[PDB]
Amino acid sequence: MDIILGIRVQDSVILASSKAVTRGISVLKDSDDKTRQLSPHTLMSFAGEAGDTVQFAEYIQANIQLYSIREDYELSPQAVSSFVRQELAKSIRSRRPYQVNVLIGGYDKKKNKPELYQIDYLGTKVELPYGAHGYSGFYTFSLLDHHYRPDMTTEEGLDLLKLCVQELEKRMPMDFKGVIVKIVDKDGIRQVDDF
Amino acid sequence: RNNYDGDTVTFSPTGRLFQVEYALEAIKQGSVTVGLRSNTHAVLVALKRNADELSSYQKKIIKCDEHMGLSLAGLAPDARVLSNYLRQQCNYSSLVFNRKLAVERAGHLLCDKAQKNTQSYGGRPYGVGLLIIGYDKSGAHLLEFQPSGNVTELYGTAIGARSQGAKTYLERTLDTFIKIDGNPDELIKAGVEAISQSLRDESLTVDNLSIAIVGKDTPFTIYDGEAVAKYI
Amino acid sequence: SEYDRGVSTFSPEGRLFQVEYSLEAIKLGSTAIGIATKEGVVLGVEKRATSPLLESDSIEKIVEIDRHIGCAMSGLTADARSMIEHARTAAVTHNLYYDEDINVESLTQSVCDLALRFGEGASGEERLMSRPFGVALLIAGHDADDGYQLFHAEPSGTFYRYNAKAIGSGSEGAQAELLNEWHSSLTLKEAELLVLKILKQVMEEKLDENNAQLSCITKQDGFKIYDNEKTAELIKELKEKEAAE
Amino acid sequence: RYDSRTTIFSPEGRLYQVEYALESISHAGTAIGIMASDGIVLAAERKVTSTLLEQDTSTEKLYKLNDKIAVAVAGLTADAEILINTARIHAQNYLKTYNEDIPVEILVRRLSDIKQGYTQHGGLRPFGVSFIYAGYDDRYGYQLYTSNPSGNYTGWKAISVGANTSAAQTLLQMDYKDDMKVDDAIELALKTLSKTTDSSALTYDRLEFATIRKGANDGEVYQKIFKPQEIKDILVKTGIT
Amino acid sequence: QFNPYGDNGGTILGIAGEDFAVLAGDTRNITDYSINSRYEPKVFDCGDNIVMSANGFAADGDALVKRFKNSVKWYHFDHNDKKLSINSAARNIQHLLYGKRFFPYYVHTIIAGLDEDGKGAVYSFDPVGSYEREQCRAGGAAASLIMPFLDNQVNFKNQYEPGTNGKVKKPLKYLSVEEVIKLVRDSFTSATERHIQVGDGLEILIVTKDGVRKEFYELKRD
């Protein structure tokens, strides 16, 4: 329960996140927002431990917004991804944890390349253009990379992602109630419907 | 010199401080109260002040406990910090030891608290006198607390403006009120006579009288209006 | 000398001169009048205008401290900001603890307890606020156990209850006039036109509503701050009444 | 007088204390940073000298705070040491936190808040120091600023502080060529340094110099404090030696 | 190791009258299968129409009772001799208990007493905070016993009227001081015979608008 997906195409980063949230044996709603925009061109999808996702998401969103606003020009996806990772790395050595895994998919304007990073719940920043966490990455490390053509476009990546989702429902006893797919590009961030 | 008119941490050539001396001044500009006591009762009679005739007059009696109470003459700001402190101690004695705090014992705690501010260079030193009554195991007692911290057990005393005539009422009639016991009525009347003389170029009115009484048979009660137009 | 420098130095009166000076701050401030009746308490204020650009109807000088408590003020707004934020917390905290209205008298005690801080520390009072408060408030409300009560919270001493009290620049002439014109036979409506009658006399400007603001404490109504139209109407009734007599 | 604590104000609505820190600069050495599109030069002048003074194997008014940003000093040197160490610590926090080098605008901005903080809070001195910041960030390229002893910053393409700022400034803005070059920065600086200084023959053991370049050994920035014999080469071109 | 918590038993019963209020309790205190006391009740006088019994553990109660009493005193001081009414007293108590949801207590407090409406009210508490307004609440060990009986005869609930065969219910009937007294006498007696933590005596304080009255009824020593 709780999956986050990521693909880097050669002009966009496409993050997907489940609409489902389960506390107890109860699905609380079939529409739940589980992805937040850190700034208007960098998006964090997030999943992880019970109610830590909510506290941590708003905490991280607020800091990136402060630094974007402070500098008076939005920070690179490279600056953003170390910072989030470093909060987590302090927390597991502190007396209170947060164990929230996240993906940063930004469009870097600084050097003009899309950038997908994989940030662990542990608090490990590594760059990967097919990253994924929890139980998703057990199925989509292999699915993305089998079909993966070394150059990619927004069109190509979306059909391959939809397919990925279609496997997950089938081989997990889970329900994600579809996934919302928000596309990160040089024109900002937008919602586009998918399976 | 009067280089000492600023320092409260530095002795004046007389061996005093001027600050402690000025604090006695504050009492003089302060509002009159007359104390007196007997073995089985103690009474505080105090003058309420007003600035005009649309004022509904200043409380000069603060109930500290249901068996102890105080009155003031001098700085009302300083009177507040010490009233807070004083209730905190009487409640402490009823909490831990199921005990009434003796009049005399309370007074020794207040003493350290005056002289702390004398020792320090921080916050105001005190400038109000408190006339304290209580009734404990050792019957009614009357202390005169000074802003120095000197606590003096008397049969009658007075502080505030024009308080030298209250001492003259009390000296003459010192023995009259030792002999009266068990009559709250008599002891109340004696303070009222007392504070007419104290005052000059004033007269008493009904709502200028606030009489506070505790004894061995009388609970701590404050009389106002029709309960003090019987002794004017 | 060494008397006006220091909060721990008394003078030959046995007083601080820190405390003295803060009275004169209130007299600097604009005129504010409160008049108690048994129908509700009426809180009127003065504002000033020296510019046609000054919006004086878009900032406050009568403020709500609870849901039946209002206050008028005079003096610096800096000293007032600390005082009213404080006084907001006291009423709010009361509803938490008991689930009952705050009484009028006890709200007064709390405001004068802040007032006490003039320095840095003391035994039995930590002081963190390092000057005199150059603001007073008229504190008006309703408890049920008395009635309507009107108090003056003094920054320099303890609190004095009044039945009608004026503060500010024009406080002096207002006080004489209230003795000869406050009475227990005077209804809610009369209370409004009384405040405006005194208000103009010590104003150095014409009686108009862009320099005025009335309010009432009616428990039935909750604390109501008035509209501009109601006040404008009443300036007109005041002048027609006095035109004829 | 107003002199007792910094918690007071003079009738100009400033403080006399700020004026006293100002004056501290104009009894120290002279300092000049000239920016060009092709590199920024930092230069300082020594305010003590002897022949039994070690100054040929050392510098004292030139510190690199990270390998992309350098500073020059004018003011008392006793004041300087504390705040250099703090700027450098702030840089390595930036490096640790964000995985990249600090912008010029922040690093200076922080330092400026800290100076003002000692004015703002307590009876503690203002620190009478003017630092010339010459930096690189890949957001506004080369950036030249200086920091006031009052604690504010203003951007630049050339600036002089130190002793005889006014005299120096008129001379710098006269000979400023609009594209500019790092080689012309280096050339201009020696000429301007000479006339303010009270020696008629400026010399390399009397010189501190650093030139910053990314225009040769591109794709990376290399900052070089010059060695004494190199300083001698550039002096020979300006015809001083 | 240590555990700081334990029991001492007792059983209490508050009922709100229409012009009266009662609060009652057994004189037995216990530790394991001994009897600590045969003549100590836990209904205590606090004044201003407040009788309070914190029945559970004796240690938890004996602390709260004093601290509450002290809070009543600081009402008079701050608020210049105004009554802290019974309803308002209830929010206070809840907040003290919440004070010690960080060191937890093990008492069912009931206060009982007279309102400003001339009609009684029973407010009954959780040992960690919250309260609700009740008509009948039994607290204490033998709480389970005393409630099926209280519902039947003080709210007339799970009862019906003949001749309609449960298609009319038995309505509320005006409760009287004599009616609850008799009820209280047999309720605590039934308790004696079928529970073993209640025994020896009965101490009932009665709250009216004309003072506090004591009425004592002895119980069996079984």
Next chain:
Amino acid sequence: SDPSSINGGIVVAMTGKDCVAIACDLRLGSQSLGVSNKFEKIFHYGHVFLGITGLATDVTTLNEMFRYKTNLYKLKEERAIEPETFTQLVSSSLYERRFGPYFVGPVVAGINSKSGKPFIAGFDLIGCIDEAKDFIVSGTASDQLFGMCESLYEPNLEPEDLFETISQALLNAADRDALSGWGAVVYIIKKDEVVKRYLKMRQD
């Protein structure tokens, strides 16, 4: 066992004769899941190379940590940090936390410039001086490597000889370990020249 055992990964450094090699695998895994096939475990502050094994967080976090301290050292003294002096530092810094100790097994290697002598040193959770002039191996396949490196080591070797020895070592030992492998990279510090030679090996 420890967290260092769950994540794994190997860094092995070795000495020849006026040279060092320090090499690593490209596997980062977080338990059973393989995470990156390309995360290099070699980092450097001047000429001193720091490998890091253990849990994935402490690989990134300690790197930031030791960077911070070598940068203040470099600027103030105007020289490069030395491997002889960095060994002192690693052991105290990790020891600072003992009640929250970092779960890693570093390897330090570099060549001193104040004599040209080759230095390698080994550490554990809170680090100790472990001196070698032979090899220091670390990780979840360290017990395999300790013997593999001893077996192939012949004392006193060329810069070109040392490549061969560390490559054959890594090649089989990483492969025959669960939690290790998935590519490798070899840094041969010849003296002050560093050549980087990627090992073609299978994906583990």
Next chain:
Amino acid sequence: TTTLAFRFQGGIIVAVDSRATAGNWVASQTVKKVIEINPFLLGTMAGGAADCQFWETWLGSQCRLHELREKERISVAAASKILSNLVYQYKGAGLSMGTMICGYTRKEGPTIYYVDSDGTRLKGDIFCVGSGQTFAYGVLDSNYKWDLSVEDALYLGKRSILAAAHRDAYSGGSVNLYHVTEDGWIYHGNHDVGELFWKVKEEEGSFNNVIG
């Protein structure tokens, strides 16, 4: 406990039980399980009895303090989010929270937020919270209509309490109805589950296990 709530066009219907259970005994059969936060906001009491009561009135202190400070009516969103911050601090202290903050304002439409003690703020339209929240969902989801009348919306929440009460082991008592309009909660009276069950059995033709 079964508490439930759902938005409709004409406002929000909040239907609750009254049954309090402690052990296999019944603690009370009268306890209002709606805390009235202020005259526009209702919260609910499920989870810990103590927690929900104190923090929601405390919540009421923040609501009152906000109106006094800025003289603007609080947002539904402002209150929930603040209870999200507050419960997280006291996380790890045995705290509980199972409250739905509901209100309908002129600047936000009807809105309901779920707050959980784990720091969770969850957006929805239909929520149910308690032990017996599950039973509350089954009936209510399937007969849910946004376009629905007040008299009928009321009927729907009532019936959600009646079926949930019946088949759960910790619920019943009485059915307390509150409808939040733009002018706040309006009480709609107290309906005992006991009698009520029988009239509804006939009307619908449901609950086919008992004949009285």
